[PDB]
Design a protein around this ligand. Structure first.
Ligand SMILES: CC(C)(COP(=O)(O)OP(=O)(O)OC[C@H]1O[C@@H](n2cnc3c(N)ncnc32)[C@H](O)[C@@H]1OP(=O)(O)O)[C@@H](O)C(=O)NCCC(=O)NCCS
Ligand SMILES: C=C(C)CC(=O)O[C@H]1C[C@@]2(COC(C)=O)[C@@H](C=C1C)O[C@@H]1[C@H](O)[C@@H](OC(C)=O)[C@@]2(C)[C@]12CO2
Ligand SMILES: [Ca+2]
Ligand SMILES: [Ca+2]
Length: 435
């Protein structure tokens, strides 16, 4: 009953090996509630799958051979997205353990809380690759819900949209006309192909071609971010105009990471900042589109230049690449190039990134997960975290922005960079180490 080709941009072999994971933590007053929470989610899963069968599907890659990396599509699998129910109460994280340590990354082992791993290591192209998987974990005093999305099938914006709709389905609210439209948008049409196009310099950053490290959460108060944004605004351009909180925080991290790396790299070492960008707005596509519609902006400089310039100069680099005409062009050029490319081996969103000196950041600040209750009766989440996976130097995320305005960055860096950052006086003025 369905055969849905992925977004041409989602046909990148890296995206086809990745699951995006997100965990929502809730307190549970009484364990008598657990079976009720399970039943409520099961019924939302059915309700969502009845309106939108494909959410329950699987990703299949057809026509692989030497010279052809294949074409992927969503096909039937089970009747609902697979749900794992895991009782950790019988040593797992507890709600009180989580509260006292500040809901640290340490305590969100993907092996413990998630139904599948982020990276395609271990088992299991004849193994199932579901579009969406859920794990409901029982913990002492609480509940962790973890949601997995196959990355070629969805970016985190699209996963959040699906999760929002599962929450509606769980409290038996009908989907609007608008939401049905977005869920049903033709993925092939979403990025219009360019009529005449030959690949040139615009796709360089997306065409090419391990040291001891860890992961840590860092938190930024609304007040620290407000001061960061002001200090960027106070030192702007002035081609622009304005910078956002997200711009300033991204710039402060590039400067700060650059700064500490001056202890181990030449001043003139090239540094590339890669920053994820939701392409839904610029493409003229509904914000509720569930697919993969993302690109990155790229920023090349040198470690010493970035560390030693005003924050406004750094934030401006970032804001300047958000020109809508340019984002569209670059994205449509990518889509056109890939459409006509049988072997997509050299294509990657981080093709030219160097783990030693780059930064690869994805801001999930705008995702709405702090708002979903799922009819569970537990209120809104107490914590929204991205589970920990293997150390991956220079890879970074911002978590969905807490309703109070707090930001948290999930940061991976090699040990000496991590320890120099944590000890950095200017960094710790604004950033609190959670771990
Ligand atoms: C690129 C991106 C990170 C930037 O986020 P952002 O800066 O918060 O959002 P916008 O670019 O839309 O700007 C909105 C902000 O700019 C401000 N702003 C917008 N226009 C303005 C103007 N004309 N004058 C002054 N301020 C303005 C807003 O007040 C808001 O600022 P605030 O958050 O500091 O209060 C974000 O748009 C994005 O694409 N996020 C998703 C990344 C992604 O795909 N990751 C998922 C991985 S699968
Ligand atoms: C191991 C890889 C395939 C490369 C990589 O860094 O992966 C990151 C980056 C990224 C996907 O990378 C590629 C090459 O497809 C995604 C997930 C992971 C694990 O997170 C973030 C985001 O969801 C992706 O876009 C991504 C580029 C990211 C950093 O911004
Ligand atoms: Ca290149
Ligand atoms: Ca290059």
């Amino acid at each position: 009953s369905f055969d849905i080709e992925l977004d041409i941009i989602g046909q990148q072999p890296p995206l086809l090996s990745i699951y995006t994971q997100i965990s929502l933590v809730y307190p549970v007053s009484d364990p008598s509630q657990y079976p009720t929470i399970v039943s409520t989610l099961e019924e939302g899963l059915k309700r969502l799958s009845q309106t939108f069968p494909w959410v329950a599907g699987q990703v299949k890659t057809e026509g692989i051979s030497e010279g052809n990396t294949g074409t992927s599509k969503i096909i039937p699998y089970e009747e609902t997205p697979r749900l794992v129910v895991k009782d950790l109460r019988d040593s797992a994280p507890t709600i009180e353990g989580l509260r006292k340590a500040g809901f640290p990354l340490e305590m969100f082992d993907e092996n413990v809380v998630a139904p599948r791993k982020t990276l395609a290591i271990g088992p299991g192209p004849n193994d199932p690759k579901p579009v969406l998987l859920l794990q409901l974990n029982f913990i002492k005093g609480g509940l962790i819900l973890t949601v997995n999305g196959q990355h070629g099938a969805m970016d985190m914006t699209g996963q959040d949209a699906i999760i929002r709709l599962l929450s509606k389905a769980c409290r038996n609210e009908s989907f609007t006309e608008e939401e049905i439209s977005a869920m049903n948008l033709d993925r092939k049409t979403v990025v219009p192909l360019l009529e005449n196009y030959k690949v040139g310099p615009e796709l360089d950053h997306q065409i090419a071609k391990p040291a001891k490290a860890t992961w840590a959460f860092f938190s930024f108060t609304p007040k620290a971010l407000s001061e960061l944004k002001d200090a960027a605004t106070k030192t702007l351009d002035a081609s622009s105009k304005f910078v956002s909180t997200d711009d300033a925080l991204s710039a402060f991290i590039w400067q700060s990471t650059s700064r500490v790396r001056l202890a181990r790299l030449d001043a003139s070492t090239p540094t590339e900042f890669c920053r994820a960008v939701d392409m839904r707005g610029p493409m003229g596509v509904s914000s509720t589109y569930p697919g993969l519609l993302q690109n990155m902006t790229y920023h090349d400089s040198t470690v010493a230049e970035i560390a030693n310039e005003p924050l406004g100069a750094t934030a401006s680099r970032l804001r300047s690449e958000l020109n809508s005409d340019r984002l569209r062009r670059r994205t449509q050029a990518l889509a056109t190039y890939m459409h006509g490319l049988p072997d997509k081996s050299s294509v990657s969103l981080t093709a030219d990134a160097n783990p030693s000196s780059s930064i690869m950041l994805s801001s999930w600040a705008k995702v709405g997960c702090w708002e979903y209750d799922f009819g569970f009766g537990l209120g809104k989440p107490e914590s929204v975290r991205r589970p920990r996976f293997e150390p991956f130097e220079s890879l970074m995320y911002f978590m969905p922005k807490k309703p109070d305005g707090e930001f948290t960055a999930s940061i991976s860096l090699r040990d000496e960079d991590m320890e120099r950052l944590k000890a950095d006086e200017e960094w710790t003025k604004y950033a609190k180490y959670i771990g």
